[PDB]
Scaffold this active site. Structure first.
Site, PDB file in Angstrom:
ATOM      1  N   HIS A 102       0.839  -1.191   0.063  1.00  0.00           N
ATOM      2  CA  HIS A 102      -0.015   0.057  -0.559  1.00  0.00           C
ATOM      3  C   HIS A 102       0.917   1.578  -0.036  1.00  0.00           C
ATOM      4  O   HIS A 102      -0.008   2.421  -0.393  1.00  0.00           O
ATOM      5  CB  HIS A 102      -0.967  -0.349   0.913  1.00  0.00           C
ATOM      6  CG  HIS A 102      -2.389  -0.803   1.287  1.00  0.00           C
ATOM      7  ND1 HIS A 102      -2.559  -1.207   2.161  1.00  0.00           N
ATOM      8  CD2 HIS A 102      -3.045  -1.282   0.194  1.00  0.00           C
ATOM      9  CE1 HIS A 102      -3.999  -2.093   1.347  1.00  0.00           C
ATOM     10  NE2 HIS A 102      -3.734  -1.825   0.576  1.00  0.00           N
ATOM     11  N   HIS A 327      -9.389  10.250   0.160  1.00  0.00           N
ATOM     12  CA  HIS A 327      -8.290   9.059   0.445  1.00  0.00           C
ATOM     13  C   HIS A 327      -7.274   9.268   1.217  1.00  0.00           C
ATOM     14  O   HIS A 327      -6.027   8.022   1.506  1.00  0.00           O
ATOM     15  CB  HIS A 327      -8.201   8.992  -0.736  1.00  0.00           C
ATOM     16  CG  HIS A 327      -7.273   7.125  -1.038  1.00  0.00           C
ATOM     17  ND1 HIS A 327      -5.912   7.295  -1.632  1.00  0.00           N
ATOM     18  CD2 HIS A 327      -7.842   6.382  -1.536  1.00  0.00           C
ATOM     19  CE1 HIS A 327      -5.605   6.135  -1.295  1.00  0.00           C
ATOM     20  NE2 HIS A 327      -6.846   5.378  -1.884  1.00  0.00           N
TER      21      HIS A 327
HETATM   22  O1  Y9G Z   1      -4.143   1.776  -0.212  1.00  0.00           O
HETATM   23  C1  Y9G Z   1      -5.248   2.064  -1.626  1.00  0.00           C
HETATM   24  O2  Y9G Z   1      -4.495   3.438  -1.490  1.00  0.00           O
HETATM   25  C2  Y9G Z   1      -5.903   1.085  -1.281  1.00  0.00           C
HETATM   26  C3  Y9G Z   1      -5.959  -0.160  -1.727  1.00  0.00           C
HETATM   27  N1  Y9G Z   1      -6.995  -0.786  -1.012  1.00  0.00           N
HETATM   28  C4  Y9G Z   1      -7.800  -0.217  -2.384  1.00  0.00           C
HETATM   29  C5  Y9G Z   1      -9.078  -1.657  -2.654  1.00  0.00           C
HETATM   30  N2  Y9G Z   1      -9.379  -2.415  -1.966  1.00  0.00           N
HETATM   31  C6  Y9G Z   1      -9.809  -3.945  -3.002  1.00  0.00           C
HETATM   32  C7  Y9G Z   1     -11.074  -4.376  -1.947  1.00  0.00           C
HETATM   33  S1  Y9G Z   1     -10.883  -5.711  -0.254  1.00  0.00           S
HETATM   34  O3  Y9G Z   1     -12.171  -5.491   0.123  1.00  0.00           O
HETATM   35  O4  Y9G Z   1     -10.004  -6.732  -1.139  1.00  0.00           O
HETATM   36  F1  Y9G Z   1      -9.672  -4.832  -0.375  1.00  0.00           F
HETATM   37  C8  Y9G Z   1     -10.615  -1.165  -3.329  1.00  0.00           C
HETATM   38  C9  Y9G Z   1     -10.475   0.791  -3.162  1.00  0.00           C
HETATM   39  C10 Y9G Z   1      -9.622   0.858  -3.122  1.00  0.00           C
HETATM   40  C11 Y9G Z   1      -8.117   0.934  -2.554  1.00  0.00           C
HETATM   41  C12 Y9G Z   1      -7.268   1.870  -2.162  1.00  0.00           C
HETATM   42  O5  Y9G Z   1      -7.197   2.574  -2.784  1.00  0.00           O
END
Ligand code: Y9G
Length: 442
Positions: A102, A327
């Protein structure tokens, strides 16, 4: 200004609220340095878009994409990058299940020196369009001369700590960037690095990462004040993990305990969690599609309804960003009247055990699933005992070097009885959003 903390530009707000914000095109501008090479650490990439954000004259300079994708997702990213012969890729190892990469960071090598950018945005159009996102811009770090032996280290140990963060990848492309960092003078850095990397940390290594890293820094470089139990903790995030069946399992036991730490001596402390309500999302600039980046699932949420009594609405009149969904992730320690803060952290870490770490093995081992990175602003690193909170984020305070730009409103406002946390995988069909649409997922 001493802090070099910025928000991304938001399309649609008055120019007053973008004056002093940064778009990615500004960060990569020749005005910031003559680019030789860059590394882009991130989670999600649109490579066609990314290359267009570099100045035309820099678009063929080497770019390293540091990602966590595997299997078909990894194949898609390589396919995205294949047209660009100057793009290399580094797959960060994720040897613990359900881990992710991340960390959002740019390493920008110039003819004039080196710059480090630690931020919160994915490298896709929508993350820089109408969201509230945070950026820390390092100084331009000059090169240490040939034959000169000096550390180039800061009072916050940032140079060694950033190298340590990169060493955890065990990656050849990142050893090259470690050697670049070795050659530059990072001594002007006034923030502390707070990273997470995947693993199981025992003994001394316990304090290197995650919430134990934060605890160690607050113990060593902050001072406790009288009535400290009255100073709240604020956490502000865009996603929530599974925290357990009640607050004692993780949130208020080890997590809050690390965030309450001040100084080396030895709870009533209010805890405010800021997370967009459904109404926040519906009336946002993006409408319901903003919830596509607020990935709180009904399966997780229904297991921890106790958590939502801590939730406060997103509100950011101070930066004109109440309708620009967050975000950014931030954590801070305000005074009881929210006029001062004991510290401020901007990070990629959401409110999850995966990101911050969870104690295992009878409290002797901190297990972390993911890569995360943020920077911590401590008053002691600026010669201060506390930061005064900036009253308007983009205004001209009487002491910019003492006045920290908190990007959303204080005090945070509790959800109303009709509010609900944004949960992204259930429908919302009672009221349309700012584009005239409902939300019907899956
Ligand atoms: O750290 C970050 O920037 C992010 C990390 N993951 C995200 C996910 N994850 C997948 C769905 S999940 O249910 O598997 F978590 C969906 C949408 C936005 C982000 C996001 O922005």
């Amino acid at each position: 200004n001493p802090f070099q903390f910025y928000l991304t530009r938001v399309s649609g707000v008055k120019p007053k609220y973008n004056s002093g914000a940064l778009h990615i095109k500004d960060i990569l501008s020749p005005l910031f340095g003559t680019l030789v090479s860059s590394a882009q650490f991130n989670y999600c990439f649109d490579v066609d878009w990314l290359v267009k954000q570099y100045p035309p004259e820099f678009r063929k300079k080497p770019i390293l994409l540091v990602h966590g994708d595997k299997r078909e997702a990894k194949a898609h990213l390589h396919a995205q990058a294949k047209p660009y012969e100057n793009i290399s890729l580094c797959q960060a190892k994720l040897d613990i299940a359900f881990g992710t990469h991340h960390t959002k960071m740019m390493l920008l090598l110039y003819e004039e020196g080196l710059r480090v950018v630690i931020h919160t945005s994915n490298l896709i159009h929508a993350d820089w369009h109408q969201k509230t996102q945070g950026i820390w811009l390092s100084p331009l770090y000059p090169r240490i001369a040939d034959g000169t032996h000096k550390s180039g280290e800061s009072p916050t140990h940032f140079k060694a700590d950033l190298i340590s963060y990169l060493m955890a990848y065990n990656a050849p492309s990142l050893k090259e960037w470690i050697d670049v960092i070795h050659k530059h003078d990072l001594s002007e850095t006034n923030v502390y690095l707070i990273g997470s990397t995947p693993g199981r940390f025992q003994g001394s290594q316990k304090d290197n990462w995650g919430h134990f890293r934060l605890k160690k820094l607050l113990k060593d470089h902050a001072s406790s004040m009288p009535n400290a139990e009255s100073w709240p903790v604020v956490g502000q995030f865009s996603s929530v993990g599974s925290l357990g069946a009640d607050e004692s399992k993780w949130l208020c036991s080890e997590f809050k305990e690390s965030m309450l730490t001040l100084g080396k001596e030895s709870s009533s402390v209010p805890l405010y969690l800021i997370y967009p309500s459904v109404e926040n999302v519906r009336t946002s600039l993006e409408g319901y599609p903003a919830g596509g980046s607020l990935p709180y699932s009904i399966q997780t949420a229904e297991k921890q309804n106790w958590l939502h009594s801590y939730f406060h609405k997103w509100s950011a009149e101070t930066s004109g960003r109440s309708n620009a969904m967050p975000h950014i992730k931030t954590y801070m320690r305000p005074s009881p009247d929210f006029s001062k803060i004991a510290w401020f952290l901007v990070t990629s870490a959401n409110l999850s055990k995966a990101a911050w770490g969870a104690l295992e093995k009878n409290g002797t081992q901190l297990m972390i699933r993911s890569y995360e990175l943020g920077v911590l602003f401590l008053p002691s690193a600026f010669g201060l005992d506390s930061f005064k909170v900036k009253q308007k984020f983009f205004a001209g305070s009487q002491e910019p070097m003492a006045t920290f730009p908190v990007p959303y409103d204080l005090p945070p406002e509790l959800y109303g009885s009709k509010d609900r946390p944004w949960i992204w995988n259930i429908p919302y069909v009672k009221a349309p959003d700012t584009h005239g649409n409902m939300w019907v997922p899956s």
